[PDB]
Amino acid sequence: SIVTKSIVNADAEARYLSPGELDRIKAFVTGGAARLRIAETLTGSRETIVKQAGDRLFQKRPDIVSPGGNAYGEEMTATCLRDMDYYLRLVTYGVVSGDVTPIEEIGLVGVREMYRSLGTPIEAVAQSVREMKEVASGLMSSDDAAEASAYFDFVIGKMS
Amino acid sequence: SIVTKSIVNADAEARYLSPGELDRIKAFVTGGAARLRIAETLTGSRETIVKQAGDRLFQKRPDIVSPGGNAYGEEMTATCLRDMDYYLRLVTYGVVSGDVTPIEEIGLVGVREMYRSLGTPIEAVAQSVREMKEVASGLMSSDDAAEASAYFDFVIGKMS
């Protein structure tokens, strides 16, 4: 939440919220209808976006579904797509919140040692979320693509 | 060296070496000829070690050399076997040193960040040095393979 972030910064500086932060919260609560629309869009169309994302991921990076890979068979392939569903619902949570903090303290801290313990390729997960950004930009309007791509870019940047 | 570890501990506690530590240096300078013989055998027969270990590594994990992968191609397998030669030379350096600190300060400090920037699975390199110690114990004497597997054992533990 941008409100949570502004309150955290004002508490760290030991002061009330500045008029700039107050104007940002006011602009966010006026403009939240578009974020509501994008949340409804991604929640309704949650299936085909991760369908095409996983498909194009596997056709560009087949080393996962190669034998000896982390997700060779369809069982850990299903767990990989469940991870993708987790990342997509966190992207929707960041979209509704207006700041990247719920993404950060749910599923972005420690992902380095997480995926060194699970053996998954970090760059392959980053490429998969990049392909999610591509298919979401294909699915939605250009300004909507940019504002969802901000959180997608945050996720791929802190994953990679 | 083991004299370097003992001298660092003795300097940290700010007095001369305890006779436990001079016992360490004494038994090391009795066994140094045997350690040098083991390292000379590995240096002489280094090529079959790297070649057989890489071949059985490719047999165990074919996803690494599958197309689109990090190690796919004759060029990438050449660089990978150069890494194998690097690690084998470092373990021989550990054998002649008597400790594992040259191993750490050459190849084990920042190796996780190294292979994360390179997109290299450290668990696959851990399996690679597992097959390294398997082939080394196969073509090395058992009491010699005990300390060789101890130093390979440290490599597996720190790098896995």
Binding site: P67, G68, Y72, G73, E75 | Q59, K60, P62
Partner: peptide, 5 residues
């Protein structure tokens, strides 16, 4: 080539 699932 075991490649166990």
């Amino acid at each position: 080539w075991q490649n166990e699932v």
